């Protein structure tokens, strides 16, 4: 049980070596105990977001154009691509990693109880003669 930050060598399982940091992938194993590991920088379109000894870098994601997403941050070597929404829009999560950008619901015949957050639509409270339906104030009659 080697300490944290080190992985066991796949062959000759008695020597452990430090894991490659973010932005690097393993190209060769440790050439003996105490030496540094062969960590190479990820190429274009590839990234590693955590400490790893993987043989290749993860493919960075692309922003979905049909969901209205925009590229807040580019595909770097150590950080994944960041996709979001433009001004006055909020993201609705269909799943853990899938979201769609929708325009913030403007209050009509009502007041804003809570402003449009990043992952939440505008909360609108209606007045007398109107009631909420699909986050929209509509007349009772």
């Amino acid at each position: 049980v080697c300490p944290q930050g080190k992985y066991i060598h796949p062959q000759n399982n008695s020597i452990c070596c430090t894991k490659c940091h973010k932005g690097t992938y393993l190209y060769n194993d440790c050439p003996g105990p105490g030496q540094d590991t062969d960590c190479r920088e990820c190429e274009s379109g590839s990234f590693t977001a955590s400490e790893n000894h993987l043989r290749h870098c993860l493919s960075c994601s692309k922003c979905r154009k049909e969901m209205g997403q925009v590229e807040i941050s580019s595909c770097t070597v150590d950080r994944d691509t960041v996709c979001g929404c433009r001004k006055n829009q909020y993201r609705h999560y269909w799943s853990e990693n899938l979201f769609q950008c929708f325009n913030c619901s403007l209050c009509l015949n009502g007041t804003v109880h809570l402003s449009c957050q990043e992952k939440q639509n505008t909360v609108c409270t209606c007045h007398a003669g109107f009631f909420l339906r699909e986050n929209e104030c509509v007349s009772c009659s």
Binding site: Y7, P10, A49, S50, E51, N52, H53, L54, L58, W94, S95, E96, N97, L98
Partner: protein
């Protein structure tokens, strides 16, 4: 001696996706473990990973519905969730006006991956309430070492 796992969805727990082993035509043999609704491989090698999820629905809801099936891997080499396989479906295109005609949508994932010892594989969905528990062989997960 080949590590093999073929698990089926539980038909008694509505609203969640739970995998079972002690059922007919289901296997957990040669080191593969079922922990925290996830499959743990016993050795490093090439595994065929497959899954099939059937979504059912009575009519089309007013809001658009997306069904996402993802086989994800949490390995000892990266220690984060990595989507090995993924698929998205849109069963309904328009709201039902009339009689609510039922809809069914199958999603199948299958691939071959190199997995190390201790890797945890999870087959996850976004809408557990739409799952099909009517008959066996409709929703299942599996990994076979090769």
């Amino acid at each position: 001696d080949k590590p093999v796992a073929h698990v089926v969805a539980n038909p008694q727990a509505e609203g969640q996706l739970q995998w079972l082993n002690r059922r007919a035509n289901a296997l957990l043999a040669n080191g593969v473990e079922l922990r925290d609704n996830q499959l743990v491989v016993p050795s490093e090698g090439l595994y065929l990973i497959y899954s099939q999820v059937l979504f059912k629905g009575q009519g089309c809801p007013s809001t658009h519905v997306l069904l996402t099936h993802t086989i994800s891997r949490i390995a000892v080499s990266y220690q984060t969730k990595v989507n090995l396989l993924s698929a998205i479906k849109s069963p309904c295109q328009r709201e039902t006006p009339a009689e609510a005609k039922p809809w069914y949508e199958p999603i199948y994932l299958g691939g071959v991956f190199q997995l190390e010892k201790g890797d945890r594989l999870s087959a996850e969905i976004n809408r557990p309430d739409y799952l099909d528990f009517a008959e066996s062989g409709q929703v299942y997960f599996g990994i076979i070492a090769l």
